[PDB]
Design a protein around this ligand. Structure first.
Ligand SMILES: C[C@H]1Nc2ccc(Cl)cc2S(=O)(=O)N1
Ligand SMILES: C[C@H]1Nc2ccc(Cl)cc2S(=O)(=O)N1
Ligand SMILES: N[C@@H](CCC(=O)O)C(=O)O
Ligand SMILES: N[C@@H](CCC(=O)O)C(=O)O
Ligand SMILES: [Zn+2]
Ligand SMILES: [Zn+2]
Ligand SMILES: [Zn+2]
Lengths: 258, 258
């Protein structure tokens, strides 16, 4: 049986190659997670098919319906057998799906347009001239929603009520917003994605401040899956062989443009 | 039933209180892991007893006997129900015990006496004047023994054959050797312990270079233990509420002496 892998279009994790449409199936894609899926499949001994998540979201549970969307929903409702993506390990998710040990570390960070007079989250909260937001249906938004830290709850109170909306449907939308907004929009996103974008043309963005928290991405499977154990061990193996570090250098820093 | 917790005397994770002789049970100890154990037990709803590991080791499997020693041993052989300690998540351990998601990140790092002419593992490997070693029966030694990376295998070949021995039985022994050796000994140990020592008088050592790897400590339980699930969720919860960061600050940097 071929394993259905859910993932998401997110640079440099999963990207359509420049040549694609002349290629077929898995070959259409490239990136850290595409390479990772390959090794994971190799060491676990399964064939697989990469599919881009239908609704284009990471995964959150609807307040009223209690229905999960995104890649999380795909696993929960049996539409996919495994997710291999920049998917954040969190408590509410670990309650409904299984995560491997983390394959990559990250924290919530701030992206600004170069020159923006912001140095920290504290800076954002103490002012109103520069607007800021996060991705919808992801862990960063939930982070601010649930934070008791004074600075972060202040930020959340502002964001949830802002007008026009400060939330974005995709990471690319957030980044495009920062770039087009003359320094009047800052974007809250994970450090991994922030650092990648910083080293890409037009080289007009910048990560400011330290990370707001510390967590990791994990490969996820439906609760009680038979793939769970093998995937976890494979991740540990790849980490100890240095393959994960290798992949990271290949996709972040070998690919620098600035 | 009272949960038997195995841990290890290692600053600032677990230390004897100054007046420990006049105190009882769990009250004899203080430190990061003592604080963490209390929270874990509170959130999981069990009573517990802290016990220091008999042989003072973290855990390695004898090449010949195939017997596990240290904390891993206590778990494998049923002397303890859970280990809460700076116990590194590794593949060979994951095969015989279970680990929660990591509560703290670290990587192997280099400790030098200030002014030592070393900037990297590569630097260490290309020279002989400065000796270097690691702790016995731990993940750091196993990392070098197993590594295929040119630089790390080269270091291992030197270390395994060096005389007198470059290996030490305790972290404190390592640090003292760095301090006593006027620059001629470098010590390979986890970044967390390295960062801690850096902040203690006499302030004569420092961490140089980037980390050689990236991993974390996890709370360990015997394979198929009923505690596994609740402990994992507890770590994520405390992580997300910011407690882990607060504890690190308390024991590392708030008490800073340098
Ligand atoms: C408790 C939580 N903490 C951390 C910290 C760092 C990294 Cl890279 C991974 C994790 S996690 O797997 O999400 N577990
Ligand atoms: C695969 C391995 N990678 C990493 C990376 C960072 C941190 Cl803090 C923890 C881990 S781990 O739990 O050992 N899993
Ligand atoms: N990695 C996040 C998506 C990006 C974000 O939330 O900032 C998640 O798994 O939900
Ligand atoms: N944390 C390590 C011990 C310290 C070291 O090996 O440097 C372990 O679990 O084995
Ligand atoms: Zn491989
Ligand atoms: Zn709804
Ligand atoms: Zn608590």
């Amino acid at each position: 049986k071929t394993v259905v892998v859910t993932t998401i279009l997110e640079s440099p994790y999963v990207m359509m190659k420049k040549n694609h449409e002349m290629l077929e199936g898995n070959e259409r894609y490239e990136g850290y997670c595409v390479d990772l899926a390959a090794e994971i499949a190799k060491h676990c001994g399964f064939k697989y098919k990469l599919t881009i998540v239908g609704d284009g979201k990471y995964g959150a549970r609807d307040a009223d319906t209690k229905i999960w969307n995104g890649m999380v929903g795909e696993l929960v409702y049996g539409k996919a057998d495994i997710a291999i993506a920049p998917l954040t390990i969190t408590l509410v998710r670990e309650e409904v799906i299984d995560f491997s040990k983390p394959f990559m570390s990250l924290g919530i960070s701030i992206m600004i347009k170069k020159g923006t007079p912001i140095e920290s989250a504290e800076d954002l909260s103490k002012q109103t001239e520069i607007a800021y937001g996060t991705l919808d249906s992801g862990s960063t938004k939930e982070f601010f929603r649930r934070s008791k830290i004074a600075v972060f709850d202040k930020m959340w109170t502002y964001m949830r009520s802002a007008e026009p909306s400060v939330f974005v449907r995709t990471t690319a939308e957030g980044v495009a917003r920062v770039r087009k907004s003359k320094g009047k929009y800052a974007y809250l996103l994970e450090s991994t994605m922030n650092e990648y974008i910083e080293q890409r043309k037009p080289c007009d963005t910048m990560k400011v401040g330290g990370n707001l928290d510390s967590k990791g991405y994990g490969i996820a499977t439906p609760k009680g899956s038979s793939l769970g154990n093998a995937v976890n061990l494979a991740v540990l193996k790849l980490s100890e062989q240095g393959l994960l570090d290798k992949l990271k250098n290949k996709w972040w820093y070998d690919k620098g443009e600035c």
